[model samples]
Target: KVFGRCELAAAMKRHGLDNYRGYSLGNWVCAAKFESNFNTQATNRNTDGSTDYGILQINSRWWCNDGRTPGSRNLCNIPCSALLSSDITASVNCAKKIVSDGNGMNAWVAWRNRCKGTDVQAWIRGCRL
Candidate 1:
């Protein structure tokens, strides 16, 4: 729905993301690329009987309440369905809290798999901080 990366960065900032764990915005943008492709309604059933919700694809087992699952950490205290909406303030708030728990974006598998251990300079390429 966006033009590309720079727009993604702009949208992310508008959604309350700025160095979301005190890291660069690029990492979050890259993770978002893999997680939900910037679609709010994006959802995927995890192999663990959990679902990933929202553009960030936050897991229901740990963060959001999916209404069908048990044993949720639910630290964000939000229903998973909230993540499916166009508004991202709730998602951003939850994600911010998630990173603040000392994981530093490690809680997101997408970041670990796609955005980590590599030169992610291109994630912010041509974009202003």
Candidate 2:
């Protein structure tokens, strides 16, 4: 599913990411904007023979196992398909695990490229709540 800016923010908040680990809802929203443009079914294949799955772009390399990414940790211990679910529970959980594993939002290249060191609140501007 594709979400509006505020709608995505609300979803992230529902998953307890509103300032979760000091990363604001705007930061998560901003990262998602750059990663998948709020699309839950998004996927991007990496040159390393791994694939990124779902809205947060959880990688098959160290995160989820797609069975194609050799030596994958499957740290989230779920199939890549879970990340692509429209419900978003698995994606959000995996995202949290990545952050808690000490990467924070730095786990996502899009966040580093676009959301880091910037006023991410603009991503949520004009949105109530």
Candidate 3:
């Protein structure tokens, strides 16, 4: 499923990402836009052989187990396939755990390059949330 900016914002808020870990709701929304363009089934394979999954693109190397990434920690303890579902419940929870364990939102290179230190609040300005 592909979500519009406002729709994704509301969905994420409902899943408890608002101000999670001291990061604002807009930050999550912005990161999702840059990472997956709001596509629920998005996936990307890195040159290092790890795959990223879901809207947040949770990684196979450390977050979810893809059964192919060498030396995976699978800290999120979920099959990477679970992250691709349209529901996004598992993906959101895994993202929360990843943030808690790593350097907050900086765990995602996409977020680091595209969202960090930027005024992400504008990303959802027209949203009803």
Per-model TM-score, in order, reads: 0.87, 0.96, 0.97
Q: What is the TM-score ranking, best to worst?
A: 3, 2, 1
Over the stretch 1-129, how does candidate 1's per-residue lDDT look in tens digits? 323677767777876677655767778888888888877888899888999998888889889888877776787899999988776778888888888888788888889998888776687788864
User: All predictions: root-mean-square deviation over Cα?
Assistant: 2.0, 0.9, 0.8
Candidate numbers sorted by lDDT from highest down: 3, 2, 1
Query: How much is the lDDT of residue 125 in candidate 2?
Result: 84
- For residue 34, what is the lDDT in candidate 1? 82
lDDT scores in order: 0.80, 0.89, 0.92
TM-score (C-alpha) between model 2 and the true structure:
0.96
For candidate 2, which ten residues in a row score worst on lDDT? 120-129
Candidate 3's C-alpha runs over 4 A off are none
Could you tell me the lDDT of residue 40 within candidate 2? 93
Worst 10 residues of 3 by lDDT: 98-107
Off by over 4 Å in 2: none
Give Cα distance to truth, residue 84, candidate 2, Å: 0.8
How do the residues 79-114 of candidate 3 rate in per-residue lDDT, one tens digit apiece?
A: 999999989899999988988985898898988998
TM-score winner, 2 or 3: 3
Higher-scoring candidate on TM-score, 1 or 3: 3
